[PDB]
């Protein structure tokens, strides 16, 4: 959730 | 459009109408900014054979005991590889003691 959001944005 | 280049003048005889030159083909206001910039190939190629004249002139200026003549540089005033205007600028000796302007400008986005 937060990891993918922080990686892709 | 060729139907938007008509101008009239009423001076001595009457309202004489005239048209701008557009009978050859269609109008083209800005053909391209690219054709006015001297792109990188021409820029780098020409400016490569620019400093060599400046070093043959700097060498000629030192051998003949001449100063930095802005008239002789007017032919090599175009752009240089860097700006030639900065070479004979006002802060030439005050801005030469600062290395790393590109990195300082880059991280300015984070400043």
């Amino acid at each position: 959730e937060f990891h993918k959001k922080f990686m892709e944005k | 459009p060729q139907s938007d280049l008509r101008w009239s003048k009423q001076t001595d005889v009457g309202i004489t109408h005239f048209r701008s030159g557009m009978s050859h083909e269609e109008d083209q206001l800005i053909p391209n900014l690219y054709r006015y910039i001297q792109p990188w190939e021409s820029e780098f190629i020409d400016s490569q054979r620019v400093w060599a004249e400046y070093a043959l002139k700097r060498q000629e200026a030192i051998a003949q005991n001449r100063r930095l003549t802005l008239e002789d540089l007017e032919d090599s005033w175009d752009r240089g590889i860097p700006r030639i205007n900065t070479l004979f600028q006002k802060d030439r000796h005050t801005l030469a003691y600062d290395k790393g302007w590109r990195v300082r400008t880059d991280f300015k986005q984070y400043q």
């Binding site: - | 391209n32 900014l33 690219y34 910039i37 990188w40 190939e41």
Partner: protein
């Protein structure tokens, strides 16, 4: 990370050779080693001459990178969404400051 990196291989099988610098993508290929089709939609072809022999060794076709294009999308979208109160002269100024970006920052690849 492999999802962020890019590898290119040049052998007897792969004649095209990709490069992605900080700006515009590029592809090199030799003139004298079974060159590719060499489309050249614009007049962008870097005749990388030999340093010693002074012979045309290859061509490096440039193209604008997708990242710069997306940045330009975002800039145009922000300017269009800057409505409501702005004066038209300010918008012309902003678009000049934007277009000059897609210009001389890189121009050979814009065509």
């Amino acid at each position: 990370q492999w999802e962020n990196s890019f590898v290119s291989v040049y052998s007897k099988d792969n004649p095209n050779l990709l490069f992605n610098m900080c700006g515009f993508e590029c592809r090199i290929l030799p003139k004298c080693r079974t060159s590719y089709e060499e489309f050249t939609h614009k007049d962008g072809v870097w005749n990388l001459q030999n340093e010693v022999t002074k012979e045309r060794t290859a061509q490096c076709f440039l193209r604008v990178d997708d990242e710069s294009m997306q940045r330009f999308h975002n800039r145009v979208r922000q300017i269009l969404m800057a409505s409501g109160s702005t004066t038209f002269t300010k918008i012309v100024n902003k678009w000049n400051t934007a277009l000059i970006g897609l210009m001389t920052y890189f121009r050979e690849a814009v065509v």
